[PDB]
Design a protein around this ligand. Structure first.
Ligand SMILES: [Cu+2]
Ligand SMILES: [Cu+2]
Ligand SMILES: [Cu+2]
Ligand SMILES: [Cu+2]
Ligand SMILES: [Cu+2]
Ligand SMILES: [Cu+2]
Ligand SMILES: [Cu+2]
Ligand SMILES: [Cu+2]
Ligand SMILES: [Cu+2]
Ligand SMILES: [Cu+2]
Ligand SMILES: [Cu+2]
Ligand SMILES: [Cu+2]
Lengths: 277, 280, 278
């Protein structure tokens, strides 16, 4: 259960599609757009060619954090990488391994928890597209990274989680002992503090300490702002057991207004003690 | 001194009580609540049973960050771990040491600068209870950790420090060369940036670089938001001498509105150079 | 090219606080050449800097620094009587130190890092007006052996402006593909921000560069910052992405919409920027 070495050339089709109630989402197949968009996963060294199509009546773009791209796949109107209504375009993302440069220094690799979003809808910074749902996660794995049993994306988009109505989660289910990966992206105007009851993670790339010499803070509450992204893997219920473990923004008015969800951790027999919605 | 190995079963009585000025606070003995609440110190591996009593006319709870607890000690109304008016309940916190798992991976230990607070007063997230002063620090030490000469707790609670009126500190005294530990917790609605004149610390677990290979950034200014907690140790006046050293939130309107205090570092003879209280 | 040498040199410099146009105020190293941000101060761990300070303004001003070692008498605060009356002069003394093992066996952190100085008395006793007006500037303290850049650029998010510039007027910064560029990022004022750069990423540690394969620091292209935060990093301009007009901006959506945007203009070796229309 470990990521291999990257270096594969990959292609994928992506669509921008209008969704109900003024929303917009990215999808891998027509009519399957979602908010957040599909989880794109690569190994360091992989190339991704996204054959992009804009099914909408307004221009859209695709912009990505962290990964290597040339200025033609900027996803910006300034560098003419947006997609007119009905248009098509191939965005190219590349990734690289860490390595020692010629100058002696250490080149950082592409691995990490990243994301993509629109850059042209509403404003030339994608303010309207991000608000409508044009955002999604990208995970770039380093060779040897432990692979999880499940991955869940939580996006604090302004006062919402994944553009959902207040006090509607989302909820995620796991069994005690599962290796669960959380991808956490923030968008919009507000800062947040992400908090998980009964679980904690390392404030580093993978969310797990590398070993006894990793000085990274171990936290259960992280401040984050627009376009921040981080991730972590936890063992569900580790040292704490089954239950309906709350997660929420800890800004007090934000959790009061419904930026809350449940990490529903079950015993092997499928039971969650005390849970009563 | 250094922190020893944990693994002891500890017991403590805690009370939630109404305090003067429409506030609420935790204490270890009845009639002795405080804001911030009492400092709790544990060694990785210790277990803590908190014999809790609610002396108030409203439900209250005890919820902790960082430490291990089963869901029955979650301290939320959502699964019946709150304490009714006049009720009692034992909460149990555990802690563990770091080590390796069967799957080859490293499990981080409980050590850190943590905190406890209410979760049911006002809202199902404790907004009223936190605002009223139901919060306190929890320190979990790892074996070998350097012990301080003194520990001081600074909570940025909305626009107050430790719920105090504007421009009323608190101030903390030390002697030059003392090893002083600061526990910094934030609560409420607003982000802040904690800044200390004349001192700096590492942005890691303990606030001190482990040694020459520790890449952690060394800072004197840290942004923090609701329920953030961190801590550090500094040598009072190290390389800067005695004096009235300001700490404050560096958000400009927050300092201008009184989120300011003094770290009063004394010379051995007790005096503080240039410290005219009236000019502060 | 080069690495930082060991420190330990006692340096002196004159500094002036001057009014600038548009009600602004700035620090400078020579009379009549004040700037916003103020001049870049660079030191090697162990150096001392005596700032021979002159307030040429009609209101009091001060000089307060982050991170470096200073005695209470160089606090730069009215509260500790180290401000400078109109027309007055004062010598501020900053010191730095290398890291080392203390007698008690613990490790003393060095002064090295990305720091800043600013006023502490104009407008309020916390310098709110001075900072608003532009009295801020960067300080870099290098550790022996630190990689030296080809150029250094200072970006300050001061309330809703970058370096007190009007909305949407940069600043822009030019480099050639392959250049080692150092960014100093400071934030001031009332608001939090998130600094983001297209096409480039860095390490969230002291230097912005991973020390090697065992450095666990996170690699980021987006960082939340708040008033008086400072961090810095070095990047290889266009590394793995090529030339072009690469945006940097605050990623708070209404902040980029209302002018907190700039361009990192990475040129080809022939000096051209593909697809860049000014
Ligand atoms: Cu952008
Ligand atoms: Cu929030
Ligand atoms: Cu919690
Ligand atoms: Cu972005
Ligand atoms: Cu909670
Ligand atoms: Cu504040
Ligand atoms: Cu300061
Ligand atoms: Cu909490
Ligand atoms: Cu200050
Ligand atoms: Cu901003
Ligand atoms: Cu970008
Ligand atoms: Cu400052």
């Amino acid at each position: 259960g470990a990521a291999p070495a990257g270096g594969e050339v990959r292609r994928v089709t992506m669509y921008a599609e209008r969704l109900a109630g003024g929303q917009m989402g990215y999808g891998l197949e027509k009519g399957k757009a979602s908010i957040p968009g599909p989880l794109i996963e690569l190994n360091e060294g992989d190339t991704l060619h996204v054959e992009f199509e804009n099914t909408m009546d307004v221009p859209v773009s695709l912009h990505v954090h962290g990964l290597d791209y040339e200025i033609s796949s900027d996803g910006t109107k300034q560098n003419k990488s947006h997609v007119e209504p009905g248009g098509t375009r191939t965005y190219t993302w590349r990734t690289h391994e860490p390595g020692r440069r010629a100058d002696g220094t250490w080149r950082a690799g592409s691995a990490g928890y990243w994301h993509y979003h629109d850059h042209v809808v509403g404003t030339e910074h994608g303010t309207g597209g991000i608000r409508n749902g044009l955002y999604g996660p990208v995970i770039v794995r380093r060779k040897g990274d432990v692979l999880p049993d499940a991955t869940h994306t939580i996006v604090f988009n302004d006062m919402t989680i994944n553009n959902r109505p207040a006090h509607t989660g989302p909820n995620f289910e796991a069994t005690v002992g599962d290796r669960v990966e959380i991808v956490m992206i923030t968008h919009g105007e507000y800062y947040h503090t992400f908090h998980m009851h009964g679980h904690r993670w390392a404030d580093n790339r993978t969310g797990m300490l590398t070993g006894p010499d990793d000085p990274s803070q171990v936290i259960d509450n992280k401040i984050c702002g627009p376009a921040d992204s981080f991730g972590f893997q936890i063992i569900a219920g580790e040292g704490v057991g089954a239950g309906a473990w709350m997660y929420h923004c800890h800004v007090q008015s934000h959790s009061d207004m419904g930026m809350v969800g449940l990490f529903l951790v079950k015993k092997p027999d499928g039971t969650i003690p005390g849970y009563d919605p």
